[PDB]
Paper text:
SARS-CoV-2 utilizes a trimeric spike glycoprotein for attachment to the host cell receptor angiotensin-converting enzyme 2 (ACE2) and for the subsequent cell entry step which involves the fusion of host cell and viral membranes. All emerging variants contain defining mutations within their spike proteins, with multiple mutations clustering within the receptor-binding domain (RBD) impacting both ACE2 binding and antibody neutralization escape, while mutations within the highly antigenic loops in the N-terminal domain (NTD) across these variants reduce antibody neutralization. Given the rapidly changing mutational and antigenic landscape of the SARS-CoV-2 spike protein, a structural understanding of spike protein mutational effects and the discovery of broadly neutralizing epitopes is of importance.
To identify structural mutational impacts on ACE2 binding we next determined the cryo-EM structures of variant spike-ACE2 complexes. Focus-refined structures of the ACE2-RBD interface enabled visualization of RBD mutations, revealing local structures which are identical to our previously reported structures using spikes harboring variant RBD mutations alone. These structural findings confirm that mutations outside of the RBD do not modulate the positioning of ACE2-contacting residues at the receptor interface via allosteric mechanisms. Our structures of VoC S proteins in complex with ACE2 demonstrate minimal structural changes in the RBD, reflecting its functional constraints in cell attachment, only permitting mutations that preserve the ACE2 binding interface.
Numbering used by the authors:
A (entry chain E): 19 to 614
B (entry chain B): 330 to 530
């Protein structure tokens, strides 16, 4: 009779047909990932094409039910998700051009090989170079050569392609009733229709700036300390008053500072909390790693893994004969099927990764009761944040002593906590200005704030102003320096890392307050606490049915992203960094004082 | 005296193929001896929920007729085979009365009723104008009209086909695995009761 009942029947046929087509696409993708063979590639492509064509036909059929005559929030949310045109609103020629541009950028980034002039007999791919030279070298000109050569080749290839990409994506977004592609990306956090819990696309930029303004003192002190240590490592290149040279940050782009922990360690003489040798001595298999992770999740009250998980997952590298992707990935195949694809080694990193991916699996399992099109995180930040909180809790010395991996007579003094917090800051705090600057630059490019002839002049100006990182030599507009990163070149949103980082510590404070932890936030473990797991599972069960603001109210009691839990987490380190920066100068100058 | 002529529970539980939930099979069991302790003491059944009578005294009581309804549903739909419960199965496929005397027996049949390509031989009615009455079977394949517009025998806009298939896969989760359900309905009528339990010597 009514339009709302008609939409409900349509979304009762859709959920059933789509779950089957999804599970076939996901199965084919799994079979390709665990077995790289040409028939598996063909089967994956066929299943993906069937899935995409089916989504196109249902999107075409879903728009005939008008949104304003539906009052039920869940039905309206599913219909809103389905009624998005995506690229379909664009013309077929332009859609084909956009798809071709995306594929060719993927090939250029994936198969970009650069080596030294006059020695071209063998070259280096993206993965060998990053793992070996950008993370381990201590030579200024070698890192400068690798950085400039990779940005020269990749940027000069990708600059016209990116110029076409911005225009096509803006055309599609304005055809989809958005201001620009940046508004399309910011629409993931948009909440409309709920009284009090409404969130606007324009509020996201203001909230990100407001949080970053509070991030800035901690980052400035960390930048000063890293600058002093890098000045010790490289004597003449780094200036006391200027920005850090770009190629010296330990990674290819400056995304993470975690590779500078060796150079910038506060107390080298004190030991680390590495438990790898202890697992090797006790012969811990990957099965034991996942069973310990499962024990951690049952301790907090969450459900344990299914039989189909232990049976169908690949938790060890298969061998030489059978090839598989080595990247750890949690798969929600649908139809109640949850699997982890990880080539697990006996390392601390793999153990923490097992906790992170099983956290992803727990999040996927929790919203299985929800309808098919609402089976996702409330926003893109929550899905990663719920894995990162498990990574935070598992890495604590209390957890390691509890599970027997660390000696019970290990002395936890202030110095080890300071160096551990510095490592966590280099991984977590260091990525925040880079993430914010990159997303703000992309938003300004999509919005038209930056003309095409001024992309790099603004970009370096942004990087000096925000990240405090200076270019080694000036770049003209023939370069395309942002697109050398994986996420930007392959059409991925980048604000998820910033939101994930803030949500991680907000969730950590909420669960630690629930678990009645009485010490520092970084010393908190959420094992053995049923109430903390219940508080988490209340949000976990909702999925995408409820607004992210309401989910955040469910966990932390706040309606907006907050920066105070992060600052509370790093407060011992913040006081220590303030003490260590008395002689040195906090802050940077945007001038060309170190090198240009 | 010497007891023989046991009831054919082998041809219901151990059947090679089961019917779909919509066209659920009903077998009337009469004029034999029904040993219910053989069913209860089996370890192969995941659900043996009895409503209106207890399993211990089933082996003693005697009934006029026994209705064995057999079908295949999903793991998450076993809960809907109960009095009062409301779901797609209860509303549109198989409805049990509130005043039901009998037992609902369900067991996981992932081994038999799944295949690696997907077994699409089990169907469920997903749409009907009204809810089913208890112990009603609807095998009609008429196009469901969700809108004012007449369907005219095509699955066009707002007009859906009622019967949908369950994609049964071995790697599926327990909730989505096929479960064979046998519902035994016990009624006592004024006619001579002939389905009796075995009597001790
Ligand atoms: C991987 O693919 C090969 C290709 O023929 C196949 O023979 C093999 O059985 C596959 N392995 C698994 C575990 O399915
Ligand atoms: C919205 O629809 C769902 C089923 O799709 C129903 O369970 C829920 O109660 C409805 N909510 C409102 C407010 O009508
Ligand atoms: C999707 O595109 C069609 C074709 O132009 C249009 O009629 C429809 O309104 C669009 N849907 C939305 C939600 O903008
Ligand atoms: C999960 O926990 C339940 C109850 O503790 C137990 O019966 C079941 O065997 C467990 N499953 C696995 C795979 O450990
Ligand atoms: C660690 O604690 C000792 C004793 O309280 C103190 O003397 C020392 O300065 C502290 N160091 C740091 C880095 O807090
Ligand atoms: C959590 O519980 C298990 C078993 O109840 C126990 O062995 C473990 O030590 C507990 N964790 C802590 C930190 O006490
Ligand atoms: C059904 O099959 C099982 C499996 O072997 C068997 O033990 C049982 O006796 C058979 N008959 C009945 C009535 O359950």
């Amino acid at each position: 009779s009514t339009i709302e009942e008609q939409a409900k029947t349509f979304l009762d046929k859709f959920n059933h047909e789509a779950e089957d087509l999804f599970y076939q696409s996901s199965l084919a993708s799994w079979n390709y990932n665990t077995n790289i063979t040409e028939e598996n590639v063909q089967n994956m492509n066929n299943a993906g094409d069937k899935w995409s064509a089916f989504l196109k036909e249902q999107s075409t059929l879903a728009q005939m039910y008008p949104l304003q005559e539906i009052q039920n929030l869940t039905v309206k949310l599913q219909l809103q998700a389905l009624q998005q045109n995506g690229s379909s609103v664009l013309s077929e020629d332009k859609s084909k051009r956009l798809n071709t541009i995306l594929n060719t950028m993927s090939t250029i980034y994936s198969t970009g090989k650069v080596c030294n002039p006059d020695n071209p007999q063998e070259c280096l791919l993206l993965e060998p170079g990053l793992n070996e030279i950008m993370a381990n070298s201590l030579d200024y000109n070698e890192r400068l050569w690798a950085w400039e050569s990779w940005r020269s080749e990749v940027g000069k290839q990708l600059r016209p392609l990116y110029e076409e990409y911005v225009v096509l994506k803006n055309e599609m977004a304005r055809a989809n009733h958005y201001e620009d592609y940046g508004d399309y990306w910011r629409g993931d956090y948009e909440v409309n229709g709920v009284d009090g819990y409404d969130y606007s696309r324009g509020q996201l930029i203001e909230d990100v700036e407001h949080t970053f303004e509070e991030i800035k003192p901690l980052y400035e002190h960390l930048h000063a300390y890293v600058r002093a240590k890098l000045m010790n490592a490289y004597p003449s290149y780094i200036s006391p008053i200027g920005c850090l040279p770009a190629h010296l940050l330990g990674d290819m782009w400056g995304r993470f500072w975690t590779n500078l922990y060796s150079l910038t360690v506060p107390f080298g003489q004190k030991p680390n909390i590495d438990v790898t040798d202890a697992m090797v001595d006790q012969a811990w298999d990957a099965q034991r790693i996942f069973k310990e992770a499962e024990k951690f999740f049952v301790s907090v009250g969450l459900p344990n893994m299914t039989q189909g998980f232990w049976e169908n997952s690949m938790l060890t590298d298969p061998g030489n004969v059978q090839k598989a992707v080595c990247h750890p990935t949690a798969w929600d195949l649908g139809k109640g099927d949850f699997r982890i694809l990880m080539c697990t080694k006996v390392t601390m990193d793999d153990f923490l990764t097992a906790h992170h991916e099983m956290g992803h699996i727990q999040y996927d399992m929790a919203y299985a009761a929800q309808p098919f099109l609402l089976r996702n995180g409330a926003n893109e930040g929550f899905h990663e944040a719920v894995g990162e909180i498990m990574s935070l809790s598992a890495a604590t010395p209390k957890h390691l002593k509890s599970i027997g991996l660390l000696s019970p007579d290990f002395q936890e003094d202030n110095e080890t906590e300071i160096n551990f917090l510095l490592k966590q800051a280099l991984t977590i705090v260091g990525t925040l200005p880079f993430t914010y600057m990159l997303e703000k630059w992309r938003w300004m490019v999509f919005k038209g704030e930056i003309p095409k002839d001024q992309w790099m002049k603004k970009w370096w100006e942004m990087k000096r102003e925000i990240v405090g990182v200076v270019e080694p030599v000036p770049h003209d507009e023939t370069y395309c320096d942002p697109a050398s990163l994986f996420h930007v070149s392959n059409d991925y949103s980048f604000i998820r890392y910033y939101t994930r980082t803030l949500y991680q510590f907000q969730f950590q404070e909420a669960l630690c307050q629930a678990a009645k932890h009485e010490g520092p936030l970084h010393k908190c473990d959420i094992s053995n606490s049923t109430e903390a797991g219940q508080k988490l599972f209340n949000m976990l069960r909702l999925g995408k049915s409820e607004p992210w603001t309401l989910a955040l109210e469910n966990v932390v009691g706040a309606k907006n992203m907050n920066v105070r839990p992060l600052l509370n987490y790093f407060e011992p380190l913040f006081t220590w960094l303030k003490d260590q920066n008395k002689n040195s100068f906090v802050g940077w100058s945007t001038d060309w004082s170190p090198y240009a | 005296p010497n007891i023989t002529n046991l009831c054919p529970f082998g041809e219901v539980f151990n059947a090679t193929r089961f019917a779909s939930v919509y066209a659920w099979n009903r077998k009337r069991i009469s004029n034999c001896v029904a040993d219910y302790s053989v069913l209860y003491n089996s370890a192969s059944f995941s659900t043996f929920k009895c409503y209106g009578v207890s399993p211990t005294k089933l082996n003693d009581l005697c009934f006029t007729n026994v209705y064995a309804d057999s079908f295949v549903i999903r793991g998450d739909e076993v809960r809907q085979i109960a009095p009062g419960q409301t779901g797609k199965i209860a509303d549109y496929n198989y409805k049990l009365p509130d005043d039901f005397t009998g037992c609902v027996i369900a067991w996981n049949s992932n081994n038999l009723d799944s295949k690696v390509g997907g077994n699409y031989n089990y169907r469920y009615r997903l749409f009907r104008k009204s809810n089913l009455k208890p112990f009603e079977r609807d095998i009609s394949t008429e196009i469901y009209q969700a809108g004012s517009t007449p369907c005219n025998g095509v699955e066009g806009f707002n007009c859906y086909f009622p019967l949908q298939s369950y994609g049964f896969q071995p790697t599926n989760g327990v909730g989505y695995q096929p479960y064979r359900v046998v519902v035994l309905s016990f009624e006592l009528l004024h006619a001579p009761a002939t389905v009796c339990g075995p009597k001790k010597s």
